[PDB]
């Protein structure tokens, strides 16, 4: 209960329809969570120097769900207020925040809606429990909506996970920015205007300015009150054991999610009773989520199977049946080459150049400046390259071309595909003309 907020993020059928696959939806959702975590962690909210996020259930609604009569999110046309209300109509006591990700256009082109937090009174925001409220229905107001399209055009992911930050900030008790100090976009000072407005702006920022990813001083101070009055209510410790998020960790053997999340037949889901949940089923001795060399029928693979493919320092790696995890790779012998013949492997990774494989140290080092340079270890007595006749027993006569891009002449060049290297600074025709004219050409030409 220190610094982490558990999110219940749901995606409607249009989100899946645009992204097509569950993998794409989960990748976008993890990207949004990571972006919002990066935004919030850096922003020192006065009281706390780190406020992370950790999604607990990634619940994704498939296009086939659209035919479900009891699902109210299938309606193609629906107001933003009504959308947020139906998000709040569900029970969300076990979550710091609960969000619905949609791909539907909203009236006036709004990019979503959340519930404004408050330090004291005005129920609604983070760490909010279900209560009767008015209208006769118990609404969990730890809820917010977000759409990835406005005016019929899909919102890019920078703007999408900026408006996600906007909605969570409203859930965090930060109102829309006001004043010249906290809204620099409208400021007539050019230096501040180029920085751009902050996240907590009534109008969606383009996401291409400096302050578009950062919380303002106004918003940070507002969030400070909420995070000093309600943080130790629903937050959790960093890295706390909370299974069902699809992330295997300590205190568990495997993870599946919830009942309608995974098709794994050898791991208990979250709806299973305490103690059994997120654990291997009795009899199924391993899980594919645990290790990459487990059978689809959830049993330890034999010794024939090899987890990994060919590597720069190992052949394949063999796990056999004793653990789900594939063990450390069996390294190739010392001085074993890697990509092209520029370096050799020592301790499972290749570094330290090539020339010490047969034994000599790399030279620092007109086309002879680009392949590889190494002398006899006793000082640059003969700094000749690999293909030189001075090395007639180690490299024979084979020349090793550097990678296309690796610099020559310290770091004022770059090797091309033609064993040559041009200056990275470069001159350019027009700039050469400018330097030939801006110089005192009266005596430079004659």
């Amino acid at each position, epitope marked *: 209960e220190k610094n982490t907020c558990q999110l219940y993020i749901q995606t409607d059928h249009l989100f899946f329809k645009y992204y097509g696959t569950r993998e794409a939806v989960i990748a976008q959702i993890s990207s949004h969570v990571k972006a919002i975590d990066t935004i919030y962690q850096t922003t020192d909210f006065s009281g706390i120097r780190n406020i992370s996020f950790m999604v607990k259930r990634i619940r994704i609604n498939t296009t086939a769900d659209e035919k479900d009569p009891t699902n109210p999110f299938r309606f193609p046309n629906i107001g933003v207020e009504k959308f947020l209300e139906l998000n709040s109509e569900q029970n969300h006591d076990d979550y710091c925040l609960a969000y619905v990700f949609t791909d539907r256009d909203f009236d006036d082109g709004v990019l979503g809606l959340a519930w404004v937090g408050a330090p004291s009174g005005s129920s609604g925001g983070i760490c909010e429990k279900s209560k009767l409220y008015s209208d006769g229905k118990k609404k969990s107001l730890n809820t917010g909506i977000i759409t990835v399209q406005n005016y019929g055009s899909h919102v890019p992911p920078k703007v999408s996970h900026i408006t996600f930050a906007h909605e969570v900030g409203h859930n965090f008790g930060s109102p829309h920015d006001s004043g010249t100090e906290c809204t620099p976009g409208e400021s007539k000072n050019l230096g501040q205007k180029e920085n751009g407005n902050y996240i907590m702006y009534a109008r969606a920022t383009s996401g291409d300015k400096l302050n578009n990813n950062k919380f303002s001083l106004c918003s940070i101070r507002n969030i400070s009150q909420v995070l000093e009055k309600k943080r130790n209510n629903c937050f959790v410790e960093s890295g706390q054991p909370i299974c069902g998020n699809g992330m295997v960790e300590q205190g568990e053997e495997c993870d599946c999610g919830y*009942s309608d999340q995974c098709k794994d*037949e*050898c791991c*208990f*889901d979250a*709806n*299973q*009773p*305490e*103690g*059994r949940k997120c654990k291997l*089923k*009795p*009899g199924k001795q391993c899980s594919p989520s645990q290790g990459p060399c487990c059978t689809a029928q959830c049993a330890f693979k034999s010794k024939s199977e090899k987890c990994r493919d060919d590597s720069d320092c190992a052949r394949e790696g063999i796990c056999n049946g004793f653990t789900a995890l594939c063990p450390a790779s069996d390294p190739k012998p010392n001085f074993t080459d890697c990509n092209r013949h520029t370096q050799v492997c020592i301790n499972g990774q290749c570094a330290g150049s090539i020339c010490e494989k047969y034994g000599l140290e790399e030279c620092t080092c007109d086309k002879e400046l680009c392949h590889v340079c190494c002398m006899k270890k006793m000082d640059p007595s003969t700094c000749a390259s690999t293909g030189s006749v001075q090395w007639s027993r180690h490299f024979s006569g084979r020349t090793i071309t550097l990678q296309p891009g690796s610099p020559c002449n310290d770091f004022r060049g770059y090797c091309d595909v033609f064993m040559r290297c041009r200056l990275v600074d470069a001159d350019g025709p027009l700039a050469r003309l400018k330097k030939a004219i801006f110089s005192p050409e009266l005596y430079e030409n004659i």
Partner: antibody
Amino acid sequence: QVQLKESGPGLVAPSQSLSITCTVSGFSLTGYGVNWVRQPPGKGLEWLGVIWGDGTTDYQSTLKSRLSISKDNSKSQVFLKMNSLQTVDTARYYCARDGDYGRLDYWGQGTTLTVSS
Amino acid sequence: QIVLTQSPAIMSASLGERVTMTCTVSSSVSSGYLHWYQQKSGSSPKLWIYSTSNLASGVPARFSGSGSGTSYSLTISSMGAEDAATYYCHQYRRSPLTFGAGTKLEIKR
């Protein structure tokens, strides 16, 4: 409260199939597993097999061939089917729920099973 | 494969005494995964102790089990006159679900 009840044929002809139904109530079968433990007359408990919340089954190794357990989550009924029961198969067939940490907290009354030509 | 050895098989304790019940597993299993059920010779085995330290609902407090690892136990502070039942030690952390042989109990009169 939460109760489990088993309906059994009682009399089973030798080498003829058996069907017992444990119509559970009070819990969602999707999140709880219902076991099947039989008991010979005045003997120790014997485990047949279980059906989990996701429909997965794990039977006893010595009764794998004959055992058959299925369920309908919406209908809230657990079904146990046995085939070719010899004279030793007579027992009392209890259905139990796999609670927290594998505990068999709630049990049914059970059905006496008599096998005799 | 696990076998839950329960000793002693037959308990004969006079009224009001302290009778202990021992369940020994073949391989060490988690403390919370072992349980206890009594069966009063014609009734469904009701859960008595779960996690080997927490009592069930509607049970006397004289039952105080304990154990961790390879050997487990169940202790009775005062032998109640209605305790005539077979107490079963059980585990389902690993397949198969193995019930104990059943430590029968009788009132030594």
